[PDB]
Amino acid sequence: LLSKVPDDKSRFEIELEFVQMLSNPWYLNFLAQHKYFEDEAFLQYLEYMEYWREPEYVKFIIYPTCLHMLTLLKNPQFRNDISRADLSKQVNDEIYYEW
Amino acid sequence: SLDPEIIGGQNNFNLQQIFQKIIQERGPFRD
Amino acid sequence: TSKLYMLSESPLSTKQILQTLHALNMLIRIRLSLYEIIPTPFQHFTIANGRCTFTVPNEFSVSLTTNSQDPKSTGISFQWIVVDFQFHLPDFSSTPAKY
Amino acid sequence: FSAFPPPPPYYKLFTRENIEKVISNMEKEEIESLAKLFKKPSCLTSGTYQMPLDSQDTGAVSASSVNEGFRADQKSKDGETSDLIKIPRRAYELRFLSRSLMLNFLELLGIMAKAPEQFPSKVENIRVLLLNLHHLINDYRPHQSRESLIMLLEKQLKHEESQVELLRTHNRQMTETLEKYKSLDFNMEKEGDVIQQLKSS
Amino acid sequence: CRCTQLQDTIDEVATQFYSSIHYLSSHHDFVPLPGQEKVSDSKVNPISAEELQFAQRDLAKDLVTKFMQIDTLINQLPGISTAPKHQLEKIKKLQNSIEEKQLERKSLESENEDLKLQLAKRIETFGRLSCVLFQ
């Protein structure tokens, strides 16, 4: 139990950027390979990311995908399949096409 | 100024998902 | 891949799900009245609560009794364009229970 | 072979134990206060853009060749003589800057074929001309975004009135089909057997 | 629509500037003077003298046509007040309008669904009765 060492302003700059990371599918794939989805703390932090959907806050977010990505990740079977490489490519290709 | 405008994604265009949901919310169907 | 891995928000309106049930039963009535083929032993049916139900006398401490209602989206009305056929979904009552 | 940064350490901090300790904090009302400071989302209002808060300014980048403003519900157009034009004023300043750019490029070709080391001056001419072109087109856009929003809101209204009227027709059809077939009753078994002895006779 | 495309056209013009000059520098230039022409054939990659003239004439034509296109688009451009008051007022009228139409829809929609329930009950009576009696 190390004492927390966070910064106020910095962690909202950071949480913005992290949401952005969540937009990337390959980052989700690596994340799953590293079995970060095994940890319950992570999932509570995801719900903490729900604060970023709020209008004043979402006004800042750059890549919309993450939001969608986040709702996508609320299904655990989805988490084990973003561990998969094939589905990963399916997701990337799906954005690429929308784009 | 800023006035609230009401728009509900009218530009953009299933019971199996309903079933699965109800399956988790009240368990078996039969009851 | 989104729509397959998508998952709805966890709230289900129980007044809603009743109204689904009403519309579902009602829709099995629609189907069955204009479903092409009923077997004559099945000619008497009850459109239950949620369910379609079907009774034929039988032994081993029960009646041969099946309940049908279905989840295929595409057909729900197309079930009538497909007078030939339909996904139906069952729930049959005997004296056993698990099997 | 490819790799990305791990998320914040404080993700690793979360436990439902410390969560339960902070709801016990809520029930009571150091460590707990640090936890709630950690749980709040303190947004920021202004001042930081790197990894601006408003869009980029043309005067900020280089010198701006002209300025203008139009009154509410009024537009300016005048008749001045280059090819004796009588046309709108913003557009004329534009056309002017464009033909001008054309000429400055012709100049550039020359100074290439006669004295190449002199080009920096002239390409500067070019650059400010293009940047002004753009700044001014940018001044045109906000109205265009607004009118596009207008057209969108108009689409929603059209869907709304059309949906209302369609529903009206459906409801009238339903009332009339309901009235045609109306034979309302309870305890229908009595009416089924009454109908059997009616059919018999 | 219009404004973004014209923006694209001036961008197209700049790209044509450096593209053109680069093309011309890239392709044959050797000029003999008094002496005899001689080349580093590999690095040179020459093009025909006539090919040169024709290509630079073509390049001029393309650029001048681009400028004409920008001009005609500037004429296509309709003058508009920078002030948004007229538009804003229109906006507010539409919002109020869709609001009241939405209220009317809501009232008539509740009455609708009530009606639907009624007829649905009468239907259900019919269906079970008809089935039983004929069968």
Number of residues in chain C: 99
Q: Tell me the C-alpha distance between E53 and D108, whole Å.
A: 19
Token code pair at residue D187: 């305890």
Q: A 46-75 residues with CB below 8 A of D? A: 48, 51, 54, 56-57
Contacts of C43 in chain E (CB under 8 A): 131, 135
Which residue blocks in chain B are alpha helix, DSSP H? Answer: 15-26
> Cβ of C8 under 8 Å from any chain A Cβ?
no
Report which DSSP code applies to E79: P
3-class secondary-structure state, position E67: helix
- What are the C-alpha distances in Å from A56 to residues A43, A51, A60, E71? 23, 10, 7, 42
Please list, in sequence order, all residues whose beta carbon lies within 8 angstroms of the beta carbon of residue D41, skipping any fewer than 6 positions away: A12, A51, A54, A57
Contact E128 C44 (CB under 8 A): no
Dist CA E44 CA D32 (whole Å):
76
**Helix D16-28, helix A40-49: angle, nearest 10:** 60
Is the C-alpha dihedral spanning C14, C18, C23, C28 positive or negative?
A: positive
3-state secondary structure of E20: helix
Q: How far apart are the first and last CA of chain A?
A: 44
Q: How far apart are CA D177 and CA D181, in angstroms?
A: 6
Beta bridge partners of D79: D86
Which whole-number Å values give the CA distances from A72 to A18, A81, C8, in the listed order? 16, 11, 10
CB atoms closer than 10 angstroms to residue A29: 22
**Which run of H or E residues covers position E3?**
helix E2-26
Measured CA distances, C97 to B27, C47, C70, C79, E131 (Å): 15, 22, 21, 30, 30
CB atoms within 10 A of CB D87: 14
Top-level CATH class of A1-99? Answer: mainly alpha
Distance from CA of D36 to the nearest CA of A (A): 12
Query: Would you list the domain boundaries of chain A?
Result: 1-99
SS3 B25: helix
Q: Flag whether residue D183 sits within 8 Å of chain E, measured between CB atoms.
A: yes
Report residue A61: phi and psi, to 5°: -65, 145
Taking contacts as CB-CB distances below 8 angstroms, the residues of chain A near D48 are: 9, 13
Q: How many CB atoms lie within 10 A of CB A91?
A: 24
Q: What is the structure's resolution, reported in angstroms to one decimal?
A: 3.4
Across-strand partners of C12?
none
Tokens 């993700």 correspond to what residue? D11
- Comparing CA positions, the residue from E129, B15, E132 lying closest to residue C24 is B15
E79–D161: do the CB atoms touch at under 8 Å? no
Is C67 within 8 Å of C48 (Cβ atoms)?
A: yes
SS (H, E, C) chain C: CHHHHCCCCCCCCHHHHHHHHHHHHHHHHHHHHHCCCCCHHHCCEEECCCCEEEEECCCCCCCEEEEECCCCCCHHHHHHHCCCCCCCCEEEECCCCCC
> Touching check for B25 and chain C: CB below 8 Å?
yes
Q: Are A31 and A94 in contact (CB under 8 A)?
A: no
- Break-preceding residues in chain B (C–N over 2.5 Å): 13
Q: Which long-range contacts (CB under 8 A, 24 or more apart) does B2-7 make?
A: B3/E92, B3/E95, B5/D153, B5/E91, B5/E95, B6/E95, B6/E98, B6/E99, B6/E102, B7/D152, B7/D153, B7/D156
Please list every residue in chain C whose beta carbon sits closer than 8 Å to the beta carbon of residue E127: 29, 33, 47
Secondary structure (DSSP) of chain D: --------HHHHH--HHHHHHHHHHHHH--HHHHHHHHH------SS------S---HHHHS---------TT---EEEETTTTEEEEHHHHHHHHHHHHHHHHHHHHHHHHHH-GGGHHHHHHHHHHHHHHHHHHHHHHHHHHHHHHHHHHHHHHHHHHHHHHHHHHHHHHHHHHHHHHT----S-HHHHHHHHHHHHH-
On the 0-12 / 13-18 / 19+ scale of CB atoms within 10 A, A65 is buried
CB C80 within 8 A of CB C99: no
Interface touch D140/E80, C-beta < 8 Å: yes
What Å distances lie between residue D13 and A3, A4, A6, D17, E12, CA to CA? 9, 8, 11, 11, 53
| Interface membership of E95 toward B (CB under 8 Å) | yes
Q: Which residues contact D74 (CB under 8 A, 6 or more apart)?
A: E81
Distance CA D174, CA E120 (A): 10
Per this entry, what is the length of chain D?
Answer: 201
What DSSP line would sit under A41-92, residue for residue?
Answer: HHHHHHHHHGGGGSHHHHTT---THHHHHHHHHTSHHHHHHHHSHHHHHHHH
Helix (H, G, I), strand (E, B) or coil at A13: helix
Contact status, residue C80 vs residue C57, Cβ threshold 8 Å: no
Q: Does E64 touch chain C (CB under 8 A)?
A: no
Distance CA D34, CA D31 (A): 5
Compute the distance between CA of residue D175 and CA of residue D168 in angstroms, rounded to an integer: 11
CA C84 – CA D144 distance, rounded (Å): 55
Interatomic CA distance for residues E30 and E32, integer angstroms: 6
Angstrom distance (rounded) from CA D15 to CA B4: 40
Chain B touched by D45 (CB under 8 Å): no
**For residue A35, what is the DSSP state?**
T
- Token pair listed for A85: 């490489």
Assess contact for D136 and D92: CB atoms under 8 A.
no
Asked if E98 and B4 touch (Cβ cutoff 8 Å), the reply is no
Contacts of B5 in chain E (CB under 8 A): 91, 95
Q: What is the largest CA-CA distance in chain A?
A: 46
Nearest CA to CA, how far is B21 from chain E (Å)? 25
Contacts of C18 in chain B (CB under 8 A): none
CA gyration radius, chain A: 14
Residue D56, CA distances (Å) to D68, D94, D142, E7, E83 in order = 18, 21, 14, 17, 21
How many D×E Cβ pairs under 8 Å? 132
Check CB contact under 8 Å for B6 and E98: yes
Place of tokens 């290709």: A93
* Residue closest to E78 by CA, chosen among D77, D69, D56, C90: D77
Within 8 A by CB and 6+ apart from D127, the residues are D62
Task: Provide the 3-class DSSP secondary structure of residue E15.
Answer: helix
With helix as H, strand as E and coil as C, how does C53-66 read? EEEECCCCCCCEEE
How far apart are the C-alpha atoms of E10 and D133, rounded to whole Å? Answer: 8
